[PDB]
Amino acid sequence: PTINQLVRKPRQSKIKKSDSPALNKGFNSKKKKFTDLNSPQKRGVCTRVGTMTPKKPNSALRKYARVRLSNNIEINAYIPGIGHNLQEHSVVLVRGGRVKDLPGVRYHIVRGALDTSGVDGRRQGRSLYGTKKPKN
Amino acid sequence: NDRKVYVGKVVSDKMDKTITVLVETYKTHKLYGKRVKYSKKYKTHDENNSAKLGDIVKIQETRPLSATKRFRLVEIVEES
Amino acid sequence: AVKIRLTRLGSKRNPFYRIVVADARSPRDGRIIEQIGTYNPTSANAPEIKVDEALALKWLNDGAKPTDTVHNILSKEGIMKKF
Amino acid sequence: KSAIKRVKTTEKAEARNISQKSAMRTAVKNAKTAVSNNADNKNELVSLAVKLVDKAAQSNLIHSNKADRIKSQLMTAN
RNA sequence: AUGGAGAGUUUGAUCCUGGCUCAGGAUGAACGCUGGCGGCGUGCCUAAUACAUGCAAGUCGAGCGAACGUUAGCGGCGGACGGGUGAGUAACACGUGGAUAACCUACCUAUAAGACUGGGAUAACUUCGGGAAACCGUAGCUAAUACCGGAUAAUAUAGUGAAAGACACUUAUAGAUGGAUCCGCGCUGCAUUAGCUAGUUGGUAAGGUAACGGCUUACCAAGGCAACGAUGCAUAGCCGACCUGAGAGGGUGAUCGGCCACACUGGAACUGAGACACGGUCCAGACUCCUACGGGAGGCAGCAGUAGGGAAUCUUCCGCAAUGGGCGAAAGCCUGACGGAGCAACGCCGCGUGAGUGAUGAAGGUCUAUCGUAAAACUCUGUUAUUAGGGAGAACAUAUGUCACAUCUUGACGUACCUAAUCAGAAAGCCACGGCUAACUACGUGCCAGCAGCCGCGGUAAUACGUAGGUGGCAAGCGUUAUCCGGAAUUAUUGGGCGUAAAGCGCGCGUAGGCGGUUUUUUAAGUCUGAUGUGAAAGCCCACGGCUCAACCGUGGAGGGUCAUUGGAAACUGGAAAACUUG
């Protein structure tokens, strides 16, 4: 803890990397290179539906979504809830980041969000997987 | 508003008064606080005189009357 | 070339202004070096005319004359016509 | 869109500067060129340009301190 | 110095830790929801996009060549224009002091030399003409306070231009304008870039910019460098702003820019009361293009709008009236500078959509007394809504009579404060629904779907889930969107380990220098601190006054932060003479 060589030679900070690096980004075609944006809002347009089986910690069954973002790369999602949207090819409002217990996926759906409304079997949630005009 | 008594020492020289004087000062950095002493180089000139092998002098900030050189003052300590 | 200016931070509820010596080719808002104060031309806020224009009235023989319909404020005074 | 008069006053400005600067181009082709060559050009052939460059430099564009450098290298050049 | 209590983190366990997820928000922060209205404000932040055009500083003269100052464009203006920004540079582009032994100038204001003498040409009327037009040819022109001899005009210690209405001209000269000729600290990162550029060192040029001078050139020697960042070199504005710390300030500097890089393009003969010029002037380029294909030259980094990219990403509603730039001895303009706004529940507020309430009150919705003092059906406020008159500010002007200045000259929004009688014109709906992040119980559910901000839940009592009457926060507000702040003491300028997390020399070696005996020290610099300069701030360590309080303005006592003077204390890092010696 000696200060001579401290202006001769400095120190570092910690070492951390931020969250969702292949997110918060809008891929170019005119100038071909991405934008570092951290946008509030964004879209999702669909390529498949997707589902993998081996689930230990829950040990029930539920699928997810394989939705591609701009212009030739693998981007993957998951539908956290009791609502099955047996759909695809949508145009939505993204939710950024991952919910607990799925590795590598960081992209999601807001309730409603211009494509569908949601799993309409919900009426008590009034704020989960599709819930609009709910008597409070 | 007058002109200072900037001083220093000498290092080397070339043909027909490529003269100089050394510049230095007491001061420190804003970050990690040590009394490390520091310098930068200047540009004075003579006929051929204020030059290498001992020219502890003064210098000025005036009209240079010079190429890119800047000083007219020599106010000495001694010679070798 | 010299003209009058004013300051701006946040109030009104009565036509207010200020006294200063800015440039000619510019808007009502201008930079002020020797702040003399402000002016209240709302005929209601009398406690706001604390303008001590000491370097603004020295343009009489330097370069100044009532312009932009501002002679009304100088109409009450009379520190001119020295030539 | 008021170029309807100053599309072209740049050009009377041109003419009324250039023809006189050229009539100086003949005023540096006599005296200053021949205050060396031994010619008669140090009397009334220096002194025409007194009132000639005076026809020039009573306006803001013609040389001002360069007027004091063109008159100190022709009249004081003895 | 108005001073630092975060959710849970270890193996199995007290214990020294270990930082994560994470918090709350604040973001030009909004998306589904929800869409009582607004005070005022900002939104090509999608793409410094290609274009539905024009759009923009503009018109005129008792001083001047058409008509009963109209009709010129000489002359003046403009042209570098308001506005648009943060495409482009590590740069005096940027905030402040500043040698001027690197600077001057008409616009703001008074003037001052005088107002003498001049010729006469050019715009229009076009005078005369070929031909898709209009592009171009003949070509006297008629004047102009002017294109314009000549006198001395001032710096020889010997430089010229003035052609005034009426009881307004050109110069010796100025205070000034952007600036700045420039000085200084302002003036970031990349060690996967040191044997240093030939000009590296600086003197020496005919030259010249209001401006010294390797700035091109003028003459010669480099080791000038030198292991210290030569140099390369990547974003390339700064600075009143905002969240903010206890304080050092610490970062982003977008509404808000006072200063500068920048207008299709490379230039550009030009020029200016201020230059290579955003609707100029020409000639090279590739663009949607206009043209008897004279060949036109235009692009909204200036309001719109079009195909758009679009988390949202706006009114072509109006036209000078809030300031006059410019033209004018004058009455007058253009505003697209500045203005008038669908307003987006974007900021948050001004408050309004139920009352006197009510005996526990029912026909009971998780539970099986709970939110039930639920209810009804009675009354209370104008404040939303039927109208109405709606004139809030404020002083404008040769001849009016003789730069202090002024009347017979200032209502699109010019109707606001709208008490106003006033019915009853509801304030969408809240999350998880246990315990922490604050939450209440369960039928659906038998692992079938499935709960879940770090902790964390359903396999036959989800005090989580599907759903259902709400208590903790709420009523213009519900879950989410992600940015740095004290918090993060996971920078350590205040607040950094050495054997052990995640950490100590192969060492004989060892340049630069960070440090670097005792005592007196010659120093009289500096710190001790300070006379001074006390040169302004709108507001400062504060508070307050105008305002239906909130959108919009102000007294500045805190001196403007060694700024215009260098100090006395030698106790010392500091021009630095030695002695001590056993270390």
From TrEMBL, chain A:
Keywords: Ribonucleoprotein, Ribosomal protein, RNA-binding, rRNA-binding, tRNA-binding. Residues 1-54, 117-136 are annotated as: Disordered. InterPro entries: NA-bd_OB-fold (IPR012340), Ribosomal_uS12 (IPR006032), Ribosomal_uS12_bac (IPR005679). GO terms for biological process: translation. GO terms for cellular component: small ribosomal subunit. One of its GO terms (molecular function) is structural constituent of ribosome. HAMAP family: Ribosomal_uS12_B. Belongs to the universal ribosomal protein uS12 family. Part of the 30S ribosomal subunit. Contacts proteins S8 and S17. May interact with IF1 in the 30S initiation complex. With S4 and S5 plays an important role in translational accuracy. PANTHER family: 30S RIBOSOMAL PROTEIN S12 FAMILY MEMBER. This is Small ribosomal subunit protein uS12.
Automatic annotation (TrEMBL), chain B:
Transmembrane segments: none annotated. The keyword RNA-binding applies. GO terms for biological process: translation. GO terms for molecular function: rRNA binding; structural constituent of ribosome. Pfam families: Ribosomal_S17 (PF00366). Keywords: Ribonucleoprotein, Ribosomal protein, RNA-binding, rRNA-binding. One of its GO terms (cellular component) is cytosolic small ribosomal subunit. Part of the 30S ribosomal subunit. One of the primary rRNA binding proteins, it binds specifically to the 5'-end of 16S ribosomal RNA. Belongs to the universal ribosomal protein uS17 family. HAMAP family: Ribosomal_uS17_B (MF_01345_B). This is Small ribosomal subunit protein uS17. It comes from Staphylococcus schweitzeri.
TrEMBL record, chain D:
Keywords: Ribonucleoprotein, Ribosomal protein, RNA-binding, rRNA-binding. It comes from the Bacteria. GO terms for biological process: translation. Binds directly to 16S ribosomal RNA. Belongs to the bacterial ribosomal protein bS20 family. NCBIfam families: S20. This is Small ribosomal subunit protein bS20. The gene is rpsT.
